[PDB]
Amino acid sequence: HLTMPYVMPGDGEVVGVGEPVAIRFDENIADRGAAEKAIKITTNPPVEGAFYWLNNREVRWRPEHFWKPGTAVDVAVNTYGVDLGEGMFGEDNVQTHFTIGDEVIATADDNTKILTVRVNGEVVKSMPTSMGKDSTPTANGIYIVGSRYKHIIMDSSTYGVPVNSPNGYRTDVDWATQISYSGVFVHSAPWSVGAQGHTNTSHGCLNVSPSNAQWFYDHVKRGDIVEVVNTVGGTLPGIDGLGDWNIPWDQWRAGNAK
């Protein structure tokens, strides 16, 4: 009858200007209202924010606009003794403190096939890219940078596409930075260096050169932003997991506490 909340980002972490507060419970939350009420978020400098639920176990909090660099955020999840619906109570209280680093926004424009990385508004890298081919396009929208891996395999069956099927793959990649839960990454793609900056050839991933992918791995952090524009795809869903900013503020603010 007890649920434990888990908070992200981590205590003491430095994250980019797109990082939402995430509170995930290990059980379904029958009373979203009570859960929201038990969560106290303080910012310095102070900024307005609001809760939106991604699913029945995880709520997000963010401002209307990207964080200001240098902002300190304090999260207190006070669920001990709170009925979070239908006799489910907090196992414990949780606190986290984190801070916002530099503004890092990397824009991938399908018209130019360049991923340009801007730090506090200035261009620091211009990276030729090859994005999703027309039949398997990269969605447009604002993606929040998640985890990074020096080497992993991306396997399409994770996303319900069989490896043996036309859009299927089971691909070893170096220097992979995850930017959607739907399985978009920025990663090293020696195999598309010819096409980078010219033609889209991937299943959705942002292919860049090995040196550029390594740079991105080394310099871009959780919470930084990749914005994709002008592709033939749709828009990354607001409830992707890293797609929070694609929900307009009016709708986000209104919430879904129901």
Curated annotation (Swiss-Prot):
Protein's job: Generates 3->3 cross-links in peptidoglycan, catalyzing the cleavage of the mDap(3)-D-Ala(4) bond of a tetrapeptide donor stem and the formation of a bond between the carbonyl of mDap(3) of the donor stem and the side chain of mDap(3) of the acceptor stem. Is specific for donor substrates containing a stem tetrapeptide since it cannot use pentapeptide stems.
Pathway: Cell wall biogenesis; peptidoglycan biosynthesis
EC numbers for this chain: 2.3.2.-
Binding residues annotated for Ca(2+), in chain numbering: D83, E86, G87
Subcellular location, record wording: Cell membrane
Keyword Metal-binding: yes
Keywords: Acyltransferase, Calcium, Cell membrane, Cell shape, Cell wall biogenesis/degradation, Lipoprotein, Membrane, Metal-binding, Palmitate, Peptidoglycan synthesis, Signal, Transferase
Top-level EC class as recorded in UniProt: transferase
A GO term from the CC aspect: plasma membrane
L,D-TPase catalytic domain span: 104-229
Activity modulation: Is irreversibly inactivated by the beta-lactams carbapenems via the formation of a covalent adduct resulting from acylation of the catalytic Cys; imipenem is the most efficient drug for in vitro LdtMt2 inactivation.
The keyword Calcium belongs to this UniProt entry's keyword annotation: yes
Domain text: Consists of two tandem immunoglobulin-like Big_5 domains in the N-terminal region (residues 56-145 and 150-250), followed by a L,D-transpeptidase catalytic domain (residues 251-378) and a C-terminal tail (residues 379-408).
Miscellaneous remark of the record: The peptidoglycan structure of stationary-phase M.tuberculosis is atypical since it contains a majority (80%) of 3->3 cross-links synthesized by L,D-transpeptidases that predominate over the 4->3 cross-links formed by the D,D-transpeptidase activity of classical penicillin-binding proteins. In fact, 3-3 cross-linkages predominate throughout all growth phases and the ratio of 4-3/3-3 linkages does not vary significantly under any growth condition.
Name used for this protein in its record: L,D-transpeptidase 2
Residue span relative to the full protein: 150 to 407 of 408
Catalytic residue positions: H187 (proton donor/acceptor), C205 (nucleophile)
Molecular function via GO: acyltransferase activity; metal ion binding; peptidoglycan L,D-transpeptidase activity
GO biological process: cell wall organization; peptidoglycan-protein cross-linking; regulation of cell shape
Membrane topology: Lipid-anchor
Consequence of changing Y169 to A/F: Decreases stability of the covalent enzyme-meropenem adduct
Annotated site location: Binds to carbapenem drug (covalent): C205
Binding site for substrate: Y169, S182, G183, N207
